[PDB]
């Protein structure tokens, strides 16, 4: 098929979807070839021992995007950035002016997960969580690993399967407590957090290491 253009995707789906639900899923974000390439790069990082442990049995590594062997991860990151730019400050009241590096995370099966939590509960400036899933042929029925979100104000929770080539946005603050349910296969995800300029400048969190 022909993928929806980035600008149209942002203005006619992501913006309205986020503002209505605070959660937004875009399936088939970059296509099979690019998705599998990202997977090859992440599996290379895992196989070369770049991951280190990060309530949760996750292993993580941070990717700037320019490192040799992470070109396709860099493309993913620039694509996320293009989507955020296209949103043209229509994501709630946020003035988005920065982001973290990419957090590559692995739950190495065997029932590993992440207990229910809020990404940013202390006002540290992160307003949007952006996650890309790269797990080829992942089936929650077999391997679990669902991301369960408990949107505030709603009785029903939202179950997000970590599907291959799947992009997810959600509000990082207390509106969206969430948990990674136990994973029974190797589960890879790439997360970027985007910052609201003013909240971040408030410096509610001071890092000393």
């Amino acid at each position: 098929t022909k993928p929806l253009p980035a600008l149209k995707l942002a203005l006619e789906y992501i913006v309205p979807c986020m503002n209505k639900h605070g959660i937004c899923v875009v399936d088939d974000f970059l296509g099979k070839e690019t998705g599998q390439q990202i997977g090859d790069e992440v599996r290379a990082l895992h196989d070369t021992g770049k991951f280190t442990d990060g309530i949760r049995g996750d292993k993580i590594t941070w990717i700037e995007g320019k490192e040799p062997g992470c070109e396709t991860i860099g493309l993913l990151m620039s694509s996320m950035d293009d989507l955020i730019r296209h949103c043209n400050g229509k994501l709630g009241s946020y003035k988005i002016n920065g982001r973290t590096k990419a957090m590559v995370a692995c739950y190495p099966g065997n029932g590993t997960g992440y207990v229910r939590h809020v990404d940013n509960p202390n006002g540290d400036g992160r307003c949007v969580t952006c996650i890309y899933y790269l797990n080829k042929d992942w089936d929650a029925k077999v391997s679990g690993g669902i991301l369960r979100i408990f949107p505030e104000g709603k009785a029903q929770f939202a179950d997000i399967e970590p599907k291959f080539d799947r992009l997810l946005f959600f509000w990082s603050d207390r509106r969206n407590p969430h948990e990674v349910q136990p994973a029974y296969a190797t589960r890879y995800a790439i997360t970027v957090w985007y910052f609201d300029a003013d909240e971040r400048a408030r410096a509610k969190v001071k890092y000393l290491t």
């Binding site: 929806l4 979807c17 399936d27």
Partner: peptide, 13 residues
């Protein structure tokens, strides 16, 4: 090309 607005999933292709 169709978004069911009561849901939060759409396929780009």
């Amino acid at each position: 090309x169709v978004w069911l607005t009561d849901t939060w999933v759409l396929s780009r292709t």
